[PDB]
Design an enzyme around this catalytic site. Sequence first.
Site, PDB file in Angstrom:
ATOM      1  N   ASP A   1     -85.125  -2.699  47.945  1.00  0.00           N
ATOM      2  CA  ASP A   1     -84.140  -3.348  47.111  1.00  0.00           C
ATOM      3  C   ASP A   1     -83.554  -2.198  46.282  1.00  0.00           C
ATOM      4  O   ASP A   1     -84.231  -1.646  45.408  1.00  0.00           O
ATOM      5  CB  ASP A   1     -84.821  -4.369  46.195  1.00  0.00           C
ATOM      6  CG  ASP A   1     -83.937  -4.820  45.040  1.00  0.00           C
ATOM      7  OD1 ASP A   1     -82.694  -4.799  45.139  1.00  0.00           O
ATOM      8  OD2 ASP A   1     -84.505  -5.219  44.013  1.00  0.00           O
TER       9      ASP A   1
ATOM     10  N   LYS B   1     -74.390   2.028  41.860  1.00  0.00           N
ATOM     11  CA  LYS B   1     -74.124   0.887  42.731  1.00  0.00           C
ATOM     12  C   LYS B   1     -72.740   0.317  42.423  1.00  0.00           C
ATOM     13  O   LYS B   1     -72.076  -0.234  43.307  1.00  0.00           O
ATOM     14  CB  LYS B   1     -75.205  -0.192  42.572  1.00  0.00           C
ATOM     15  CG  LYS B   1     -75.152  -1.307  43.620  1.00  0.00           C
ATOM     16  CD  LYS B   1     -76.479  -2.052  43.665  1.00  0.00           C
ATOM     17  CE  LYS B   1     -76.471  -3.227  44.648  1.00  0.00           C
ATOM     18  NZ  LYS B   1     -77.846  -3.779  44.849  1.00  0.00           N
TER      19      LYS B   1
ATOM     20  N   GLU C   1     -78.908  -9.771  49.598  1.00  0.00           N
ATOM     21  CA  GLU C   1     -80.001  -9.995  48.666  1.00  0.00           C
ATOM     22  C   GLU C   1     -80.457 -11.458  48.592  1.00  0.00           C
ATOM     23  O   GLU C   1     -81.655 -11.716  48.606  1.00  0.00           O
ATOM     24  CB  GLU C   1     -79.647  -9.448  47.283  1.00  0.00           C
ATOM     25  CG  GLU C   1     -79.496  -7.930  47.261  1.00  0.00           C
ATOM     26  CD  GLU C   1     -78.867  -7.419  45.987  1.00  0.00           C
ATOM     27  OE1 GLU C   1     -78.817  -8.170  44.998  1.00  0.00           O
ATOM     28  OE2 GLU C   1     -78.413  -6.263  45.967  1.00  0.00           O
TER      29      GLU C   1
ATOM     30  N   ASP D   1     -79.722 -15.376  40.616  1.00  0.00           N
ATOM     31  CA  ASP D   1     -80.085 -13.975  40.402  1.00  0.00           C
ATOM     32  C   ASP D   1     -79.550 -13.420  39.086  1.00  0.00           C
ATOM     33  O   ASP D   1     -78.355 -13.165  38.961  1.00  0.00           O
ATOM     34  CB  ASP D   1     -79.558 -13.152  41.586  1.00  0.00           C
ATOM     35  CG  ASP D   1     -80.240 -11.800  41.725  1.00  0.00           C
ATOM     36  OD1 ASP D   1     -80.940 -11.370  40.789  1.00  0.00           O
ATOM     37  OD2 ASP D   1     -80.060 -11.154  42.787  1.00  0.00           O
TER      38      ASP D   1
HETATM   39  N1  LIG Z   1     -90.625 -10.325  31.268  1.00  0.00           N
HETATM   40  C1  LIG Z   1     -89.319 -10.173  31.272  1.00  0.00           C
HETATM   41  N2  LIG Z   1     -88.558 -10.920  30.466  1.00  0.00           N
HETATM   42  C2  LIG Z   1     -87.281 -10.687  30.418  1.00  0.00           C
HETATM   43  N3  LIG Z   1     -86.573  -9.776  31.066  1.00  0.00           N
HETATM   44  C3  LIG Z   1     -87.362  -9.044  31.872  1.00  0.00           C
HETATM   45  C4  LIG Z   1     -88.706  -9.179  32.034  1.00  0.00           C
HETATM   46  N4  LIG Z   1     -89.200  -8.250  32.962  1.00  0.00           N
HETATM   47  C5  LIG Z   1     -88.108  -7.590  33.315  1.00  0.00           C
HETATM   48  N5  LIG Z   1     -86.958  -8.024  32.680  1.00  0.00           N
HETATM   49  C6  LIG Z   1     -85.549  -7.575  32.761  1.00  0.00           C
HETATM   50  O1  LIG Z   1     -85.069  -7.602  34.104  1.00  0.00           O
HETATM   51  C7  LIG Z   1     -83.959  -6.740  34.141  1.00  0.00           C
HETATM   52  C8  LIG Z   1     -84.116  -5.986  35.425  1.00  0.00           C
HETATM   53  O2  LIG Z   1     -83.964  -6.916  36.442  1.00  0.00           O
HETATM   54  P1  LIG Z   1     -84.020  -6.541  37.932  1.00  0.00           P
HETATM   55  O3  LIG Z   1     -83.800  -7.783  38.703  1.00  0.00           O
HETATM   56  O4  LIG Z   1     -85.250  -5.772  38.165  1.00  0.00           O
HETATM   57  O5  LIG Z   1     -82.744  -5.668  38.103  1.00  0.00           O
HETATM   58  P2  LIG Z   1     -81.466  -5.528  39.028  1.00  0.00           P
HETATM   59  O6  LIG Z   1     -80.407  -6.356  38.393  1.00  0.00           O
HETATM   60  O7  LIG Z   1     -81.296  -4.067  38.842  1.00  0.00           O
HETATM   61  O8  LIG Z   1     -81.740  -5.897  40.411  1.00  0.00           O
HETATM   62  C9  LIG Z   1     -83.992  -5.894  32.838  1.00  0.00           C
HETATM   63  O9  LIG Z   1     -82.897  -6.438  32.058  1.00  0.00           O
HETATM   64  C10 LIG Z   1     -85.386  -6.136  32.281  1.00  0.00           C
HETATM   65  O10 LIG Z   1     -85.406  -6.111  30.843  1.00  0.00           O
HETATM   66 MG   LIG Z   2     -81.328  -7.375  41.778  1.00  0.00          MG
END
Ligand SMILES: Nc1ncnc2c1ncn2[C@@H]1O[C@H](COP(=O)(O)OP(=O)(O)O)[C@@H](O)[C@H]1O
Ligand SMILES: [Mg+2]
EC number: 3.6.4.10
Length: 378
Positions: free
Chosen positions: A7, A68, A172, A196
Amino acid sequence: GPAVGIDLGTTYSCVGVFQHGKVEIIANDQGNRTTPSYVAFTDTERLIGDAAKNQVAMNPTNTVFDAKRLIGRRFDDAVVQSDMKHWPFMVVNDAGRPKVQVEYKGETKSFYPEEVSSMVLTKMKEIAEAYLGKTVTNAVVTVPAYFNDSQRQATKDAGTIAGLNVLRIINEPTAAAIAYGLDKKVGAERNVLIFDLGGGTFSVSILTIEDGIFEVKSTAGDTHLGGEDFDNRMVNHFIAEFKRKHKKDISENKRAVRRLRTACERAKRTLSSSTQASIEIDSLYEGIDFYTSITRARFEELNADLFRGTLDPVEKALRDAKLDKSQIHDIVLVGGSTRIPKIQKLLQDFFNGKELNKSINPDEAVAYGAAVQAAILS
Ligand SMILES: Nc1ncnc2c1ncn2[C@@H]1O[C@H](COP(=O)(O)OP(=O)(O)O)[C@@H](O)[C@H]1O
Ligand SMILES: [Mg+2]
């Protein structure tokens, strides 16, 4: 060597491998199961991942992120023109193509977005290899459902220059469905909703699955709404509090702000499991230590409008796909932000109590599905 699933995210990336019927989300050198899509260039080295993000407040102009958002796009792109107005690093034109300009080892160098992403891709690959104790070559990389041929081309290229043999590029939302096994044939049409909410992007996709064949019937969301917007609200809140207690405005001091943001993001994560978290920052501005805390309640109201507005794209996706709430069979949570309790409540209330698929960490869901897909293709 096993094929892996990757990913390649806007803010966070994740890698998994399917072995012995079980999928495994590989933790990095720092022990995290997802690693920042950050690349930093200094006098002596090129830092990638956590090491890169752990120094952005010190090397803003030379720490690259959001690649990205550039990949497979032109410099003349309105998106790019808008976006770059907020990046601390330089984006230069090169025969129509955009390039990021940084200073590495004293010398000025520029990179094509696909080169930056390959750096992140290489980091994931070495993470997999360190774990598997063998070289990883074949892989399945994911990309948003709305990516055009150019963007997919570039993502594929980022893979080749990383030494990865990209078996396939899959969407995705589709990868998230496969993770939950919603791709199995049950002799009937199934409507799945993928919600998402990640770090900086928000995407809602409605998939129709029949006989194993997916069909993205609708999509909606916001390319500029994510977990970072929630952090900012916390920041603005604390910048104001500091001013009350110490009658000092730390807004101008970029370092104070960036350090405060890091503390906010971490408190935020805690708030998804606890009702309050403490912010302990030594010598934030001048020599004043900022010791304070927030409650889940306050956090929720600081982001109320943002959380609520999350339902608008859901309604839109519905009407476009020509479906009523009752017609969607499964709802799967993807993205780190969906771990937030208020977001889960809100969505469930909207779908009148329907059960939410969330047994798999939402920020690992996409990698997980890709890893399974990599397995079948090998
Ligand atoms: N326990 C949590 N509560 C809230 N936000 C979280 C938690 N764990 C991770 N995040 C948030 O998830 C986000 C990252 O999301 P992710 O899906 O990994 O990213 P992407 O959008 O890059 O695919 C960040 O904003 C991070 O703060
Ligand atoms: Mg993502």
